[PDB]
């Protein structure tokens, strides 16, 4: 369903809905499409689209 990923670099909140995340930050994926998955910021429940490049899976 929703896997957990960690940001390797800050995203860049440019869109009004994009979820901003920083490097080393942990995020929860809810629906990974094919290039931009919408994760949730553990900071305080932030939900926004995250790029499939900045963040990486907890594994590799």
């Amino acid at each position: 369903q929703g896997d957990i990923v960690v940001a390797l670099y800050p995203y860049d909140g440019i869109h009004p809905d994009d979820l901003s995340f920083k490097k080393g930050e942990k995020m929860k994926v809810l629906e990974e499409h094919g290039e931009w998955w919408k994760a949730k910021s553990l900071l305080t429940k932030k939900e926004g689209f995250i790029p499939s490049n900045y963040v990486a899976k907890l594994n590799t």
Partner: peptide, 22 residues
């Protein structure tokens, strides 16, 4: 080291994926 501030380019967003809602 020296810099300490990396950041790869993001994806393109299929049909405004990470852009707007749908």
């Amino acid at each position: 080291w020296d810099p300490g501030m990396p950041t790869p380019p993001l994806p393109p967003r299929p049909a405004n994926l990470g852009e707007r809602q749908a």
